[PDB]
Design a protein around this ligand. Structure first.
Ligand SMILES: Nc1nc2c(ncn2[C@@H]2O[C@H](COP(=O)(O)OP(=O)(O)NP(=O)(O)O)[C@@H](O)[C@H]2O)c(=O)[nH]1
Ligand SMILES: [Mg+2]
Length: 261
C-alpha cells in the first residue's frame, strides 16, 4: 500500500510523458494524495477534477482558478457522461508540445502520448479509462492513435491525520465504510449540511425547522423514512446509511465540502 502501490507508480513514471491526477471535485484539496504528488516532481501533469456533476459548479470554478494560478493545468470532468473528456488530449499535446517538438527536431519520430492515471480510491480512475478507451477493459490501454494509458490502484497516504480531511474522504466514499464508524461520518455530514445547505436538508426530509440537537435530527430522519428496529425504536445504523446514501447519490443536490483560499 504505502510502499507497494508507491513503487508501482515510481516505476511506471519512467515510462510516461504526462500524469493525469484525478481528484474528487467535491473536495479538490482533501482528495489530493501528498505522498504520491511528492513522487511526481517535474513530470508534466493535469489535475482532473472528476465527478464535477456532483459538485457545486461555482466552487469547482474557484478551485480550477486556484490551481491554474499555481501553475497547475486543471480540467473539471464527468467520467460517466463524458463532460470535458474532449479537452484532455488537446491539453496534453499543448503541455508536451516543447518536449515533442524537441524530439522531432533531433530525429525521433512522434509516438502516441503516454499518460499515467493516479488518484485516491473510488475517484473514478477506471470509469475515465473505460470511457476514453470506449471499451470495458478496467498495462497500456489504447485510446485511438493519440493516447496510451496506464492504470494504477487507488492509494491513500499515512499522515492524513487531519480529522477533517478524514471525514471528507469518508463521507465522499474514498474509504471502505466497513472499517469506520459510519455514524460519526453521518454526524459530520448533517452538521455540514446545516451550516452550508440548510434549505436542502429541510426540503429533503420535509423539515419545517431543523432541530438544534443533532441527535434529535437523527430521530426526525429515522421516523421520517421508517428506520425502526425494535417495535418502534429508531434504528440509528439504518438511519446513518440513509443519510450517507442521500449525500452520495446527490439527494441533497450538488455539494462541495471545501473552497479555496
Ligand atoms: N457522478 C459521477 N460518478 C462518477 C464519475 N466517475 C466515476 N463515478 C462513479 O464513481 C464510482 C467509482 O468509480 P471507479 O471508476 O470504480 O473508481 P476507481 O478510482 O477506479 N476505484 P479504485 O481506486 O478502487 O480502483 C463508480 O460508481 C462510478 O460510476 C463522475 O464523473 N461522475
Ligand atoms: Mg479502478
Amino acid at each position: 500500500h504505502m510502499a507497494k502501490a508507491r513503487r508501482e507508480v515510481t516505476e511506471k513514471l519512467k515510462l510516461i510523458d504526462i500524469v493525469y491526477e484525478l481528484v474528487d471535485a467535491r473536495i479538490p484539496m482533501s482528495s489530493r494524495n501528498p505522498m504520491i504528488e511528492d513522487i511526481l516532481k517535474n513530470k508534466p501533469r493535469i489535475m482532473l477534477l472528476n465527478k464535477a456533476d456532483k459538485a457545486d459548479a461555482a466552487v469547482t470554478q474557484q478551485w480550477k482558478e486556484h490551481f491554474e494560478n499555481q501553475g497547475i493545468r486543471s480540467l473539471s470532468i464527468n467520467s460517466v457522461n463524458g463532460q470535458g473528456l474532449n479537452q484532455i488530449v488537446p491539453a496534453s499535446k499543448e503541455i508536451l508540445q516543447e518536449k515533442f517538438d524537441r524530439m522531432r527536431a533531433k530525429g525521433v519520430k512522434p509516438r502516441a502520448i503516454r499518460a499515467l492515471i493516479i488518484g485516491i480510491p473510488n475517484v473514478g480512475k477506471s470509469t475515465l479509462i473505460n470511457r476514453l478507451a470506449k471499451k470495458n477493459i478496467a498495462q497500456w490501454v489504447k485510446v485511438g492513435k493519440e493516447l496510451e494509458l496506464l492504470d494504477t490502484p487507488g492509494i491513500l497516504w499515512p499522515k492524513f491525520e487531519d480529522e477533517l480531511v478524514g471525514l471528507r474522504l469518508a463521507v465522499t466514499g474514498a474509504i471502505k465504510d466497513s472499517i469506520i464508524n459510519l455514524q460519526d461520518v453521518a454526524v459530520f455530514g448533517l452538521r455540514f449540511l446545516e451550516e452550508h445547505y440548510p434549505e436542502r436538508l429541510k426540503e429533503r426530509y420535509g423539515l419545517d425547522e431543523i432541530p438544534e440537537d443533532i441527535a434529535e435530527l437523527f430521530d426526525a430522519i429515522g421516523e421520517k423514512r421508517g428506520c425502526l428496529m425494535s417495535g418502534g425504536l429508531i434504528n440509528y445504523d439504518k438511519t446513518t446509511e440513509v443519510i450517507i446514501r442521500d449525500i452520495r447519490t446527490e439527494k441533497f443536490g450538488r455539494l462541495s465540502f471545501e473552497q479555496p483560499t
